[PDB]
Design a protein around this ligand. Structure first.
Ligand SMILES: [Ca+2]
Ligand SMILES: [Ca+2]
Lengths: 35, 35, 35, 35, 35, 35, 35, 35
């Protein structure tokens, strides 16, 4: 696992894309990025 | 811990209210209900 | 339909908001939120 | 199953005693009375 | 006025608590519940 | 600034998208997402 | 520190070799060369 | 054309790889990276 820092606005943006409650940031980003 | 059944639309609505990536449904609902 | 987990205290809190005997969690939560 | 009439206030009072989402009025009243 | 359905056994139980002939289910329950 | 965890593979994937040497993860992700 | 000029295509090529977000051109080039 | 910042030691290292007097940094780096 690696740590990344994002600006507050970008963090909220990512968190709001949660589709499965409690899922990791990796699952969200992978879904948003199509990766 | 108790399990609850909600319709799909309501589930997505709740999940989209995640403020802290990976937080539980309890933390989201408590925040949404101000309880 | 989707399933979610909530702490015992929160579950009781929601249950106690029943206004129509035998109604679903969705009906209760949707009323509690204003949606 | 038999049907009984109750005043609005009494109905709300009973409904608010729900402990298990979706449970019947018989389960609630039996719990409230101890029988 | 609201309608509630109770199991046969519970209905008889409630009816047997009549203290004033011809009284409503609300009067009986209110008395049995101390409400 | 807030901190998020990402799997190693995802980190490398994001890092490789650098277009301006030394730029932040926020600049990269915002570009990758279009927001 | 010293400054050098590189064609756009080469710059992008180097940038894309970022392995640690926000690292300097020196860190990237030194890794790419084996030095 | 884009500008890059490198440490002094790395700059001298690159300059010492000149094969054609007066050639650019791009030509040297491209040759060194086989790109
Ligand atoms: Ca019913
Ligand atoms: Ca940094």
């Amino acid at each position: 696992m690696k740590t990344i820092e994002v600006d507050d606005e970008l963090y909220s943006y990512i968190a709001s894309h949660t589709k499965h409650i409690g899922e990791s940031a990796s699952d969200i980003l992978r879904r948003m990025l199509k990766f």
